[PDB]
Structure 1
Amino acid sequence: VNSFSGYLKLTDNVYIKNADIVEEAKKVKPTVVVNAANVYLKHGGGVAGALNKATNNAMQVESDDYIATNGPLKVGGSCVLSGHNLAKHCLHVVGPNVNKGEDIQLLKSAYENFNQHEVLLAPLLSAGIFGADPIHSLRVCVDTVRTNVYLAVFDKNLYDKLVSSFL
């Protein structure tokens, strides 16, 4: 049993809810919240900007030190950092950004990072300002992630479309 509430079950391991990933993290304090990161961990907008704002910029300060030591992530890669006031840990995952011309085949590699964690609260990778089709992102998630993932879909309109169209 876990603390996640109000989710619709899509498969054995994937659950979905119309929710802002930030308010959900604040309520649950999950072991792992996933950030929709870029390779520079520059948390300007989208899910990353919202998560970072909720940490009072502490996520960005920690991230700048990580990049100064390690250099940029790979598209499709990840790193584990603090979850600050939102979660125990934040898994920063880089999905391909279609609005920068990155290979959408890298979306599967991105979701494979989730398999290193038994339970996660996550957004749909490469959705929103990363420019991918969220229906596609949900299909790759279901077909790639084997651990238990609780997806927070911000847009109510999109949430209803994802559920209604799910095979």
Structure 2
Amino acid sequence: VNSFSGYLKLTDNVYIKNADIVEEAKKVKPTVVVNAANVYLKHGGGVAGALNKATNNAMQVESDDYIATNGPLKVGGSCVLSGHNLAKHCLHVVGPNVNKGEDIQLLKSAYENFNQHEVLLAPLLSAGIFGADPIHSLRVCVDTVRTNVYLAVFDKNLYDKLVSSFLE
């Protein structure tokens, strides 16, 4: 169960690996995989699109049905849906998109959602096309998450900069 391999332990509860979150989810089948979602759960590209494609679009169909019944999420919020073939559950978390004018302070609220689950496989919230400084996103994760989080970062250059930044 939760057989994470090759991670570097940064703190008592935060681990990090240079890896594709989709490939990690297939190998580990964690209890929870985090999706870096938007408020309408439209998994159009990036991490969210890759996780959806690995479920052969079942995650998008389920997400559309969720939004029809419940309405959109809030920035900083989350919902629990099926993990399909990737995990027992998928925790869809909306980090702020600072390239769209959303407040970076909401990144603390976004990582707070992780605390309702004992173990999670997750990406670096608000990084990539969401525009946040990835070194800042790792600092907010370390300061906010109290449960056990395994971060998969699919870029060796960024992985090295994050580990060097943490060990300063």
Q: Give the ranges of 4+ consecutive aligned residues of structure 1 lying more than 3 Å apart after TM superposition.
A: none
Q: CA deviation at 1:166?
A: 0.7
Identity level (%): 100
SS in 1 for 2:139: helix
1:47-68 deviations in whole A, cap 9, x for unaligned?
Answer: 1011001111100000000000
Is there any run of 5+ residues in structure 2 with no aligned partner, and where? none
Q: CA deviation at 1:138?
A: 0.2
1:117-143 deviations in whole A, cap 9, x for unaligned?
Answer: 000000010011111111000000000
**Distance (Å, rounded) in 2 between the aligned partners of 1:19 and 1:48:** 15
**Distance (Å, rounded) in 1 between the aligned partners of 2:67 and 2:165:** 39
Q: CA deviation at 1:82?
A: 0.3
**Distance (Å, rounded) in 1 between the aligned partners of 2:27 and 2:157:** 23
Q: CA deviation at 1:6?
A: 0.3
Conserved 8 A contact 2:2-2:29: no
Q: CA deviation at 1:2?
A: 4.6
Q: CA deviation at 1:17?
A: 0.2
Shift in CA distance, 22/2, structure 1 to aligned 2, threshold 3 Å: closer
Q: CA deviation at 1:46?
A: 1.2
Conserved 8 A contact 2:107-2:125: yes
Using the size of structure 1 for normalisation, the TM-score is: 0.98
Is there any run of 5+ residues in structure 1 with no aligned partner, and where? none
**Distance (Å, rounded) in 1 between the aligned partners of 2:43 and 2:58:** 11
1:95-150 deviations in whole A, cap 9, x for unaligned?
Answer: 00011110000000000000000000000100111111110000000000000000
SS in 2 for 1:135: helix
1:16-60 deviations in whole A, cap 9, x for unaligned?
Answer: 000000000000000000000000000011110110011111000
1:110 — aligned with what?
A: 110
2:67 — aligned with what?
A: 67
* Greater mean alpha carbon deviation, residues 86-95 or residues 124-133: 124-133
Using the size of structure 2 for normalisation, the TM-score is: 0.98
**Distance (Å, rounded) in 1 between the aligned partners of 2:129 and 2:119:** 25
Conserved 8 A contact 2:2-2:31: no
Aligned residues: 167
Conserved 8 A contact 2:117-2:147: yes
**Distance (Å, rounded) in 1 between the aligned partners of 2:39 and 2:27:** 28
